[PDB]
Structures are given as structure tokens and as C-alpha cells.
Amino acid sequence: IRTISKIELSKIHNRYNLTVDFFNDLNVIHGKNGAGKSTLIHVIANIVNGDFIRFAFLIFEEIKATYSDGLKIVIRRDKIDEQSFISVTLSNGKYIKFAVGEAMATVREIESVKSMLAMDIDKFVKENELQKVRASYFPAFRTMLEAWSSSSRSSFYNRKASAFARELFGQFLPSINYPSPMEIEDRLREEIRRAQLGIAAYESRTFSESFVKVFSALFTGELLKEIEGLAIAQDSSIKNGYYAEYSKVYEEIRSLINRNNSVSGALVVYRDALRDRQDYQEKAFSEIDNYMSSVNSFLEDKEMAYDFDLRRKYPKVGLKFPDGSWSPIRVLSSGERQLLTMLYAASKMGDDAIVLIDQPEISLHIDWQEDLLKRMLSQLSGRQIIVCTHSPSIATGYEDFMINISPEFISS
């Protein structure tokens, strides 16, 4: 796909320029205080999302962004006859240019339905395919922000939170797209439902095909033990919480054999059907179990797991305590919630995006900081992760991916 590769800044706040070269897998960005780490992340998040109307609220001269596939976006701020203008020029020659006062008027109309400028921006970014890759933006103020959101948000619906955060931290701030734990829970429920429905379709297909193969092939001590082990393992799984009578069927079949060639084929296709159902159960629940194993490697006195009951039909997703109690995901602390969101963003279940995390060491103990990046990279999503951190316990073991930022101050 497309990953960012180079950001070229010119006279941010009329005093410094910057040029950062990235990796396609992991970029651990560190620097001094006030170096421009949060500003760099804001620039990248605005460029990748295609929210070019943010750039009327930044004082600059020229911003060039190079991706991995070669597409270059050049944003230039000019001042013609005391009137300031933003001109966005791509690498294929396609370009747009608008006035800063026009952009401020569009933002004011948003404060009250697309404008002409918003429609033109959307047309320009849609016809040029500027929105191939999303950008999940994790701000530094997310801990108080979700408490504010939980007192009155999703990736697609974050208008109020983006408006409040842009009011507090200036209008250059990108939209707050990082997933809430409610969004994580809903996505988990949908993935469980999709896996169950695929399992049901597989049950129907395997039942019909197995009946055909049995009836066609109709016209051993180790096999019974192997089928016994497979039926015991099938009965002892959480995924079989709607029907768990495999050992009884195995005992009935064994008693049918024991009371008195072609039956050997039925035995081996029974073993093969059990193996195929068990493997399709693992395949359909692969991402969920991998993600929950990544999360439960951090939590101490509880573990996240799912449960199915035959009376209800709502699959319960939440925290499980060693005493058997069940609690939803909102009873987590702040650090556990941060782990949950930052691990869902690096999961395969999340959307294709560029994961921008600002200060990942917020509200995390030193034991969790040493393992966060390892557990994010162990899911093998293939993302490009850009983190702006101050913690050496986060960045340990990844000194090949560390990027130092040193902006150049220009005198006048």
C-alpha cells in the first residue's frame, strides 16, 4: 500500500523548518521540548486525512509530503496583495488554490451542510484518490477527553469532540478519529456474529458433503481414542457454548460399534469432520482470540473473554474475574483503557490506517511501557506506526526505528 516517507516543512511560525525521513513499519519519534513533535504529527494527520482546510490556521510557507509510492503533495501558503492564499499542488500537476479568508468563512459556516469550498475540496481529494489510507489520531489529551465524552463519540461520529478539542487547542487540530472502547466492543460483537454465521454456513456445507461422502463410501483402536480426544476438546471450548454434546454422541457411536471396512470410512470422515469444524472455529475466531491474548497478557486480576448462553442470543463480551463475575469494559481504569484502545488500533480488526499516537506513556506503569510496542508489533497488521514519546521504557529495544527531531531556527 501507501505509507508516508518524507515531510518537508518551511518556516513554521516563521521561525523553523523541518525535514523528517520515515520508515514503513515503525517510527519512534523523540526530541526536545517544543521541538515540533506534536506539530509534525498534526501536519501528517491533516495531510493523510485530506483535511487541507486545517492549513489556513498555520503560519508557514511551503509543506511537501512524499509517500512511499511516489505521490507528492505540496502545500504552499502565499500572501498576494495582503490576502493570504493556500495552494495545494500534487505531483501529477493537479492543483487547487483558495483564500485563507475563504477557508475561515467555511469554518465559520461549519460552526453554524457543506460549503462551496468544502465541496470543491472533497471533489479535489476524491478525483485525485487522496484518501486511500486513513489516519487514526491519538491525542495527548485523550484521558480527560474521553471522560468529557463519557459525561454528556465514534471514529465516524466525533463531530462534537472534534469541535471541542479544536476550540481548546486551536483549529489546526485534526479530527479525533481514535476508537472509543464502546466502538471496540461493538466491533467485537459484530466480528463474533460474523464468525458464528460463517461457522453455521460451514456446518451446513460440511453436513451435506459428509453425508454424501459417507453414503458413497459405504457401498481402529487408535481412531476411537483420537476421536475421543477431539470430541473432548470440542466440548471444552467456549466457542461451542450453544451446543456441547459431542462426547455423548461419541459414546453413543462407540456403543453402536461395540455391540456388534465400510464403517472405517465413516469413522475417519467423522474424525475429519471434527478436525475441519475445529479448524474453521479457530480460523473464524483467529483475530479475536489473538487480540484478546494480546490484551490479556497485560491485565493482572482479570481477563477479557466472551461467553455464549443458549437462553439469550446476545453474545456477552467483557471482563472476567477469577471469582466468576462479569463486568463491561467501562469499569476499566485509565491505563487499562489506554492499553485497550492502543492495542485495538494495531489489530487486524481495525481499519487500514496510519496509527499516530502522541505520548503513549500517559497513565502507564513502567512494566506496561516495556511491552506495549512489542505487543503492538506482534499482531503483524502491517501498519505504519508513528509515536511521539518521551519515555525510554517505551522505546527500548527499538533503537533502529528511533528518529530524532532537530528543527532549524532561522534568524531574521
Binding site: I366, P392, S393, T396
Partner: protein, 305 residues
Amino acid sequence: SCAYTIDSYITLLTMSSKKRLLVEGRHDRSHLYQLIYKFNPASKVKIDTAQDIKASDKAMSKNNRLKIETIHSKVKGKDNISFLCDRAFREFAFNDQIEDLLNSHYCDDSLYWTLGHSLENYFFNPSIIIDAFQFLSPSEYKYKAIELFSELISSSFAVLAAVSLAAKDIDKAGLPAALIDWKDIVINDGTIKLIRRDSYDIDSACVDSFFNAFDAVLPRVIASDVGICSRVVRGHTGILLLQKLFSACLYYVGREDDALQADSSANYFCNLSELSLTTALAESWVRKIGVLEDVYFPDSLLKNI
């Protein structure tokens, strides 16, 4: 606990732009801070301690030297960090006479060794010990006790080194700390003779083995040079041994005027905290640098940073 690992600390070295120094303990940090602030009171060197770095290995957990060697080996070539360790008895020969195979400060890519056994061996100049004991004294019979102590200190270094060598031969380094008491010491004409007291809290096997090692090592230490002898004395052992030696000389020379007052002052000196003595010696040692040519310090280390 709330502390960095080896790898996290190495990453911190990559991130930080300060000039850093890594020593084993906090006492070394305090002493080196006084040393640095004497030459440059506005210096910005930050001193870390390997004692406050967690190690996953159980053996490396409490082996400060192994932590420093491991860290220095893994970042060999960095510019902003220097290392200091304690030489201990390394590069010393015990072939019937004490011989120093280095006779200078070790240097290997910002890794340095103390000239003596440890950092506290810089305090073993007689003038520093005098000044420090004079400043920190009961102030009853200080002048005569200091004069007697100044007489004893020349030959006492052989006794102290013999005690340290006897401790390291049986690997019971902390044994003379609780075994030998100031009352066992006798003040002679510049020398001392720790009589084997019949009554001891420790078992007789350890006491007998200790005196066997002491007797077998004492003529070898006697034949050695005095200057070489003052550097092989264990840093922690020597401080306590001097505290007892001063308690003994104070009671020996002050009992005639008042036995009870001398005993109270001697016990008071013996009850002085080790930290108080080391800090007073450190301040005196800092003050004597640049005044006397016989006072040493890791000049190469300061020059390097």
C-alpha cells in the same frame, strides 16, 4: 519497584544529550558530586547509580560491577557517558609482598577504575583523616588524641591491610566489622596489636580462621611498601577500622584525666555513623585537592567528561 532496566537505561542514554557518569552506589554519587562542584559549581553532569537499575538476572541483580561492564560493553563507543568502577584487589600481587601491577588509573573507552581498592581509598591520606577526625570529635581531649593517632597512622596501615587481606582470604569480608572491637586494640608506640579476645559473640571457628589468616598474612604486609599498602585497604573496612583505632587511642590517652569521660567519648566516636565519617572525610578530601600534591583523584575521568 519503580526503576529502569538495563535496556531501558541504554535507550535513555541514546535519548539524553547530557554528559552522564555511571557509578555503583549512591555514596559514590554524593562524593563525586562534591568533587565536580568544587571544580565547576555550575557543571551539568548527571550521575546515575547502577544500584538503582533493575536486572532480570538474579546474579547480575546485586553485582554492580557486572552491571557496569554489561552496559559499557553494549554501548562501547558512545560519547556522552563515562564509567567508574572499584578496582578491588584486581591487578594486585600477594607473592609474599604487596605488588600493584597497574600503579595508575585504568582506562578503556570511558571505563575507569579507582586507583586504590575502591573510591574510599582516596580518603586514606593522613592529613585528610586528621582534619576530618579533628572536626568530628567529642572535643574533650582532641589534640592529644590526634597527636597520638598521627603517630599510630604510619604503622597502622600495615595492620589494616593485613586485616583486609585476612578477611578476603576466608571470603568473610564483613567479619572484621563485627568481630574486632576497639577495646581489643592496644595502643603501642605507633603500632597496634589486636589481641585475640577469649569472649566473642561470633563462633570460635570463624574467629580462629580469621586470626590464622591474619597471622599468615601479617609478615607479608609488613614487607610491603607503605604507599602501596594504603591503597589495598578495603574502603568500607578501613573506615570502621580507623573509627575503632581512634576510639582506642582516645580512650588510651584520655583515661588518666578522666576514665569515664574518655570511655564516653571513645564510645561516642565508635557510635558515630559511618555516613557522617565518610561525608566529613569526603569534604576534607575535596578541600585538600590542589593544596597537597599527595592527594589523588580521578583526574583523567574529570578531564574526559
